[PDB]
Paper text:
Ferroptosis suppressive protein 1 (FSP1) is one of the main regulators that negatively regulates ferroptosis through the GPX4‐independent FSP1–CoQ10–NAD(P)H axis and is a potential therapeutic target for ferroptosis‐related diseases. Unlike GPX4, which primarily functions in the cytoplasm and mitochondria, FSP1 localizes to mitochondria‐associated membranes (MAMs) 29 and exerts antiferroptotic effects as a coenzyme Q10 (CoQ10) oxidoreductase. 26 FSP1 reduces CoQ10 to its antioxidant form, ubiquinol, which subsequently acts as a lipid peroxidation scavenger within the mitochondrial membrane. Similar to other flavoprotein oxidoreductases, 34 , 35 the overall structure of hFSP1 comprised two tandem Rossmann fold domains (RFD) and a C‐terminal domain.
The two RFDs include 6‐hydroxy‐flavin adenine dinucleotide (FAD) and nicotinamide adenine dinucleotide (reduced from, NADH), and the C‐terminal domain is responsible for substrate binding, which will be discussed later. While adenine interacts with V82 and S250, isoalloxazine interacts with A295, Y296, and K355. The hydrogen bonds found between the two phosphate groups and F21, G22, and D285 further contribute to the interaction of 6‐hydroxy‐FAD and hFSP1. Y296 and F360 together clamp the quinone group of CoQ, and mutagenesis of Y296 and F360 disrupted the activity of hFSP1.
Numbering used by the authors: 10 to 373
């Protein structure tokens, strides 16, 4: 019938879709459990640079006003076509965009519901923990952990940083071998110590994000590393809380929703999945969440116009690793790119400006 879209999740995917619909004057409601969007892509820098955290949270209210509702989605009532919020509120939808992202540990993710002031302060508190600590361990040498280790060494080149990683090679396994090698070479040039093929084994006794006189980190192999600070970069998990019951039969084992070339959820013409929660065969990226949002919004419109849907054309992997504000490496459509490009394109600003642009607000 008449258009009234509901978007579950104000992440990179959700704010792209919401600003698009808002610009098209398409009625919609954006729902998020938090009161502001988190530019998590810069949360590592927010962990090492004083006064940076305020640049990484953007209030939904200011941008979306009455098209925003803060709330915890607890289910999808498909028979009545409504989104269900904790407390009892129900939002009817003509079309549903599921953009729930994923959960993970601080600092890389901030899934907590808290005041903007507490959220910013949690990171400020993190910057002081790092500045106190002479020895620091980063657990997990995927694409998050290598940035975290590199950020620390760049801002504080006197500190002793150890990166412990259970794989033989650093960062995403889909990356070009040349890109992974240069990630390693940059870390060593910066003086980060690498413990490869080691799994930290006593995580449940380690205080995290907290300076301490003495922290004993152990590994499967029996290595022990004494440290002042431990930071977890051990990965993220698809957040399926909003839809896992109503869509149980459509979920991949990751909890992602199976989708067709049009990003329609399997079995549905008026439900779309974008961002991390969509079952696409690619590393989880804010970059791709935005691309998914274009296609979902385009295809809601296309489908009411009764026109054929657009297909997502995946191509070769594009992926940029910032290595502190002064370095980095990555690839574009499957081809290596080096320090000057990555440092100017990602490392300097970590795409922060793009989120304020989408939100139509100016950073403090
Ligand atoms: C951990 C990490 C990830 C990076 C990083 N860097 C990059 C990068 O440079 N480039 C990139 O493209 N991706 C990068 N990524 C990946 C990127 O973070 C993810 O691909 C990206 O966040 C995906 O965006 P989505 O829109 O899919 O999801 P979000 O997590 O952004 O937003 C989800 C929202 O849904 C809301 N939500 C979920 N379930 C809900 C529910 N039941 N009720 C209400 N709200 C809910 C949540 O509160 C949350 O705000 C990085 O440095 C780190 C440390
Ligand atoms: N540049 C970018 O676009 C960018 C940056 C960061 C993250 N991401 C994406 O976000 C997602 C999450 O990335 P991530 O690096 O946070 O997680 P990840 O799962 O990609 O990497 C974490 C790594 O930690 C290792 N690990 C787990 N437990 C461990 C332990 N106890 N000791 C040692 N190592 C341990 C795991 O084997 C894993 O390889 C991925 O899809 C990634 O592509 C993208």
């Amino acid at each position: 019938g008449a258009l009234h879209v509901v978007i579950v999740g104000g992440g990179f995917g959700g704010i792209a879709a919401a600003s698009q619909l808002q610009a098209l004057n398409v009625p919609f409601m954006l729902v998020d459990m938090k009161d502001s969007f988190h530019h998590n892509v810069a949360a590592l820098r927010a962990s090492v640079e004083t006064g940076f955290a305020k640049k990484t949270f953007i209030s939904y209210s200011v941008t979306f006003k009455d098209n925003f509702r803060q709330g915890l989605v607890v289910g999808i009532d498909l028979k009545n076509q409504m989104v269900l919020l904790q407390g009892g509120e129900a939002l009817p939808f003509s079309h549903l965009i599921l953009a729930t992202g994923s959960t993970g540990p601080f600092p890389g993710k901030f899934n907590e519901v808290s005041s903007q002031q507490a959220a910013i302060q949690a990171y400020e508190d993190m910057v002081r923990q790092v500045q106190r600590s002479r020895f620091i361990v980063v657990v997990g040498g995927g694409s998050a952990g290598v940035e975290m280790a590199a950020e620390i060494k760049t801002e504080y080149p006197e500190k002793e940083v150890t990166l412990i990683h259970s794989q033989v090679a650093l960062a995403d396994k889909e990356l070009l071998p040349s890109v992974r090698q240069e990630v390693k070479e940059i870390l060593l040039r910066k003086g980060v110590q690498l413990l490869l093929s080691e799994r930290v084994s006593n995580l449940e006794e380690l205080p995290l994000n907290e300076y301490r006189e003495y922290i004993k980190v152990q590994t499967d192999k029996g290595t022990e590393v004494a440290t002042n600070l431990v930071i977890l970069c051990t990965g993220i998990k698809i957040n399926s809380s909003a839809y896992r019951k109503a869509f149980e039969s459509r979920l991949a084992s990751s909890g992602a929703l199976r989708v067709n070339e049009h990003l329609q959820v399997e079995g549905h013409s008026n439900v779309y999945a974008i961002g991390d929660c969509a079952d696409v065969r690619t590393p989880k990226m804010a970059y791709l969440a935005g691309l998914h949002a274009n296609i979902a919004v385009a295809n809601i419109v296309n489908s009411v116009k009764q026109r054929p849907l657009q297909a997502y054309k995946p191509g070769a992997l594009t992926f940029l690793l910032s290595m502190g504000r002064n370095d980095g490496v990555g690839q574009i459509s499957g081809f290596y790119v080096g320090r000057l490009m990555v440092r100017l394109t990602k490392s300097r600003d970590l795409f922060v400006s793009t989120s304020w642009k989408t939100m139509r607000q100016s950073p403090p």
